[PDB]
């Protein structure tokens, strides 16, 4: 018999199949491989810290769950065991583009669990009524968003307290920030999808035309519940945590579609979160954690529920009922799927944690009027360079 411990970060709400009923599935039927899923008890950018802290104790979880942009990060901090055999013997159960984002310098370091594509979730019910369509250009979206905040009713929003990934995901959707040339990190953050961002979301919030409430503050929850919120760009695994938030308004009656070319990417989309699982240094059962993961990773239709669009090809989940329920009978698991195909490649600097942080703070300023939207990229081009280079590597700006 070997024990085998799992920290995660999954949701386990109400309407979800919860992880530890989906462990007590392996456990009843593999009693030499016996396993523990603890959920992380704190916010989502503490976990790491106490992944470096468990490590360096030597008291850390065989597994635990691993943004793909937080894998550089704990990859140079030493946190992780090279499975690489082991996760070739399960490359063809999972999605090539997330499998590669599991791997360093041809190493892999566990296996991917989920992707984060952005999309767009809208009162498809209520833009018929009101007259309005899902805006096709960058122009459309700014007049129609006036058009709508003149009667309170918002179809954009701009979440501070998301800039990491709601800017570098809609300004990724058409290039990359980080790049690697032979020894060097090449940043800017300042490219052409980022210019474009900037400018529609300046424009929208030079023009009250965006909410801009912190997306995990109360006043978020308020502006679905309420019908002021009707559209808003949206992470495809927020689908049943924004059910959720609704309270029941606009059951029946909301849609996703994807992302619009609003921001010069045309029929693509960017990243927002998305993880694997990772075996850590330390682990002393990474082939029997690897046959459990691969297992656990392929429990589709449970995954799902918890809102993941799985990296797993085993099998197609069908959208969940309460899903389809709230978005008006569609199939937005095929819209997600969509969107996750359409995702730009998009390399994560090692410590985009900090790069977030500090984009956090001016997107607040940009919310405001105190800054602009363009001073967050700014903001980010400055952070990643310092970053790195505190943390020794070599960096080219
Ligand atoms: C990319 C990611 O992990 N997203 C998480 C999301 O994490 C953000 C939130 O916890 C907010 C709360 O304000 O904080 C962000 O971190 C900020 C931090 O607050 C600041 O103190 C610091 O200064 O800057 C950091 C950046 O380092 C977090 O980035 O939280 C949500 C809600 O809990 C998570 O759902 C989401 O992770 C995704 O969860 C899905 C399951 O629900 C999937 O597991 C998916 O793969 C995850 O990406
Ligand atoms: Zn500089």
């Known amino acids: ?13 109400k309407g979800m199949t919860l992880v530890n009923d989906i462990v007590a599935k392996w456990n009843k039927e593999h009693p030499n491989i016996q396993v523990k899923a603890t959920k992380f008890d704190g916010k989502a950018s ?10 360096k104790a030597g008291n850390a979880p065989d597994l635990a769950q691993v943004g793909y942009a937080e894998v550089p990060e ?43 594509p952005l999309a767009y979730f809208y009162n498809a019910a209520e833009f018929e009524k009101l007259g309005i369509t899902v805006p096709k250009t960058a122009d459309e979206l700014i007049e129609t968003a006036k058009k709508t905040a003149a009667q309170g009713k918002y179809i954009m929003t701009f979440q501070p307290d998301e800039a ?51 997306r995990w503050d109360a006043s978020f929850d ?7 919120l009707i ?33 010069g990417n045309g029929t693509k989309t960017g990243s927002d979160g998305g993880s694997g699982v990772a075996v850590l240094k330390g682990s002393k059962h990474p082939a029997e954690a690897m046959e459990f993961l691969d297992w656990f990773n392929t429990q589709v239709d ?13 099998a197609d989940a069908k959208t969940p009922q309460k899903w389809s329920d709230y978005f008006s009978g569609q199939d937005v698991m095929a819209e997600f799927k969509t969107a996750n195909d359409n995702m730009g490649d998009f390399t994560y600097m090692p410590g985009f944690s900090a790069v977030g942080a500090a984009m956090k703070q001016t997107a ?5 009027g105190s800054a602009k939207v363009s001073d967050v990229f700014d903001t980010a081009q400055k952070t990643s360079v310092d970053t790195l280079k505190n943390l020794g590597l070599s960096v080219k700006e």
């Open 1 to 13: 018999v070997v024990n085998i411990t799992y920290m995660h970060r999954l949701p386990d709400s």
């Open 164 to 214: 990491m990934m709601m800017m570098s995901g809609q300004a990724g959707a058409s290039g990359p920030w980080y790049k690697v040339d032979g020894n060097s990190w090449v940043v800017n953050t300042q490219t052409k999808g980022s210019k474009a961002v900037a400018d529609v979301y300046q424009q929208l919030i030079d023009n009250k035309a965006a909410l801009t409430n912190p």
């Open 74 to 116: 704990v990859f140079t901090k030493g946190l992780l065991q090279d499975v690489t055999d082991e996760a070739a013997k399960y490359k063809d159960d999972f999605a090539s583009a997330p499998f590669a984002l599991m791997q360093v310098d041809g190493k892999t370091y566990g296996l991917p669990q989920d992707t984060g």
């Open 231 to 263: 559209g808003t760009v949206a992470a495809a695994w927020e689908a049943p945590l924004f059910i959720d938030s609704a309270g029941g308004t606009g059951a029946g009656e909301w849609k996703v579609t994807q992302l619009g070319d609003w921001f």
């Open 46 to 55: 503490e976990m790491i810290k106490k992944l470096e802290t468990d490590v």
């Open 302 to 314: 449970d995954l799902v529920s918890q809102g993941l669009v799985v990296a797993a090809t085993t």
């Open 364 to 368: 607040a300023k940009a919310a405001d």
């Open 222 to 228: 308020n502006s679905i519940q309420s019908g002021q």
